[PDB]
Design a protein around this ligand. Sequence first.
Ligand SMILES: O=C(O)c1ccccn1
Ligand SMILES: O=C(O)c1ccccn1
Ligand SMILES: [Fe+2]
Ligand SMILES: [Fe+2]
Ligand SMILES: [Fe+2]
Ligand SMILES: [Fe+2]
Lengths: 174, 174
Amino acid sequence: MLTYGAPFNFPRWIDEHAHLLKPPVGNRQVWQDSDFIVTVVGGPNHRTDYHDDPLEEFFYQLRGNAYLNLWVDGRRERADLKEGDIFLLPPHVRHSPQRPEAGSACLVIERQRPAGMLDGFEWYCDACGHLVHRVEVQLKSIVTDLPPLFESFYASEDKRRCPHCGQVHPGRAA
Amino acid sequence: MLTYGAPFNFPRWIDEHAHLLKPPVGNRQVWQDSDFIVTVVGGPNHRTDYHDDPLEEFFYQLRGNAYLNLWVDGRRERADLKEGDIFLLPPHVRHSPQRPEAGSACLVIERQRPAGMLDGFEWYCDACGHLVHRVEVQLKSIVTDLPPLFESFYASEDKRRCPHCGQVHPGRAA
Ligand SMILES: O=C(O)c1ccccn1
Ligand SMILES: O=C(O)c1ccccn1
Ligand SMILES: [Fe+2]
Ligand SMILES: [Fe+2]
Ligand SMILES: [Fe+2]
Ligand SMILES: [Fe+2]
């Protein structure tokens, strides 16, 4: 059977879910309990965490523009997602997506992670660039598994303290 | 490093590869040697084989219209991919994509299959509906692993012969 339902018009779906593609929610997963995790992410949203995904991430910036702050070869780099761009991110490339525009929409496709394959979330020192804190998580549900992780970092000067230079990371906004 | 390169404009890429999105080639994979197999499929193309994919298939019909002939719950059914539609096909749902329109373009995303996880290709009797022939294949490369499979079916009245009613399947065109 068609477990995931029939085909349906994507622009219409995006328009119908526009109220969820903005703060405070910001994103909406298309199908539940599927192997391919298909999400539409809107904006505005800025963030300071880097994601270490053990599998690939596919991006197709449908409306508006965004960018990914990356670590590439030990250096801070930026990959721009201009409207119309597609991009495939290799496993483990650290990325912090920034989505400054309201009304923007990006198709992001990932795979469910197998048991034992963990995701990392990391923060780096604005002053010296050293890793400040890393949490590894078995990501089963984004909604329940992820926000408390972020909240616990923001609430803790210990977690936010750079082990190299001692500077306390700002937390939620940089 | 960005193994798969930087982001790039998708409509421009599709326009630049338009000569490959029509007979005799018909499709073009976007990135090589990636876990996510990302393809753009054009037209026109009609076919008689059903695919039994052990993993999910994601579709986004970007330009023009297409449709999938399916077996759902023991009955012949059709899922239309109208321009703008997205669709997620569950594993093992038999599907025969038909792409009647020139200039059409559909984003199709699949995963590389692990060793031991095989794809099936099947043909069914137009008269009685019984399975006529099935081949299982470890799909490593579409270009080399798949066309000879199809050719060997078309060239063989034995393979094309229905075991229930004896009718010889037409082969390439129905
Ligand atoms: O939710 C994710 O997995 C993700 C996607 C893009 C950038 C950072 N994180
Ligand atoms: O190439 C495939 O895996 C495929 C895709 C869609 C329909 C039939 N086959
Ligand atoms: Fe990510
Ligand atoms: Fe520091
Ligand atoms: Fe298929
Ligand atoms: Fe038959």
